[PDB]
Amino acid sequence: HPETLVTVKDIESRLGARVGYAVLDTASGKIWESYRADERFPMMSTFKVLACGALLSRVDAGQEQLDRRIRFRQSDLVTYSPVTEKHLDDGMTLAELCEAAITMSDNTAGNLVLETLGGPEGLTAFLRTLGDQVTRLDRWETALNEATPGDERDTTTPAAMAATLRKLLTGDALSPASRQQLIDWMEADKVAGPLLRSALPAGWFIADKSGAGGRGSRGIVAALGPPGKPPRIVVIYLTETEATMDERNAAIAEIGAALIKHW
Template sequence: MARPTSLRKTSAIATATVFAFLLSGCAPATSPRAVPSPAASTQTAKSSANADAKFTNLEAAHDARLGVYAVDTGTGEEVVWRSDERFAFASTSKALSAAALLDSVGIAGLSADVDVAAEDIVSSSPQTQQHVGASMTLGELAAASVQHSDNTAANLVVEHLGGPAGFDSALSRIGDDTTEATRTEPSLNEWVPGDRRDTTTPRALTMDLRTYVLGDVLSGEERELLTTWLIDHSLGDTLVRAGTPQGWTVGDKSGAAAYGTRNDIAVIWPPSGSPIVIAVMSSRTEADAEYDDALVAAAASAAVALLDKRS
């Protein structure tokens, strides 16, 4: 399949058109290049003294704990920094629950209607609050969850998977025994240090995203639609996207939680060569600390440079 060639499209009309094409059996022009599953690649760590210095300096400069895992899917080279430490996953999980929904129902199943009741609505639900008393399709809910980080849409998607336990089981089926999903939005963002609920690691997030977007768990059409949702993500311009060179294509999903938690997971397509998959996670020591987009962007930039993708 061809690599995505268009940058993020913010038009709701464009998104609706792509979704309609997929439901009619047609594929959009933008589609990911399939690569071997993570288990099929030999990965060489780029945790050199230079890498350690970069991330140590970023943590000091931004007064935060930082976790990074990035892999060049062509060479298998990886960048690691606190890659196996736990962080709250926050709304990055919406990309994975939407992917798990695709795996569960397929393209055709996305046309099923779901009633949206007033009691379903939680905070930060810009799309679903417009449909109270009516219905949205599963596809519309998944798109709203990924593209606009709509919390109610995410909860309804997870409910269709069997609740947090069902979502957790879906991740286990693709080999993720690290992530622990236990709550729904917005309470899953009420993380405190040491709490394992609704946490994961940068490595696990990267592997999950790689498996769903570039692996063979989903069909070609399902991967294409998931990729479109990620590229159309409307809240990521100051995160991994800001840390990649102009003209590269990025599909991402951001998240934020207590203790200054700020995350972004992404697939990055350079103009030539294989995609990079990356997770950048961060937190701070105070419960009400502000999160720091600049830290995520700088960490992504450093990881891309370490993978020699700017040359």
């Protein structure tokens, strides 16, 4: 849509950033709008949706139990672990860890979920079973946020991420209760206030997950739409900028506002 392209090109000029996005209609399976959709961007914490989807896939296959309790130590804590650092003595269930990784973006929680999958290599192998030949996780938290330009480790493309999220969130990669559990966690996202949610019309559905990383990287993945209607997958990444957090937040929100205005 010409509206959105005006917005994104202004962001790229104002902030000096590389911006990419894709909007995928889940009812039709068609890309509704996109920009740099085949370019790579760092996933940052948006990988956590994929990690929890992979865990739920193992649950569905009888290989894993959501109420299994994980015990961990202070030595497992990485930067920004607001939930996991409270449970060094009693541990956490896998459901609680997924909830922490998605709703709070807890970094140790993300690592502990990854561990159940066989690490970044195991998550990448799960993505290949979904037909995603592009997305790759290579490192753990917090090194995966480094976002060195030209480094393809820990990246996706907006088109690849949108297609993979469709399969997880509205497709049949997961059982209906498991798919709804992933949606529930994403609906409960506590750390994406100033992004797509700031543009969302009253009463609309949104399930999302944000990310922030090195070299000004910022991003969000989401399913959103009017209530009771098939949603669209929205993927927005930006990187390589000196822009402030406030400016990067506003950029993503302005793209969302343009998408909403002509939904």
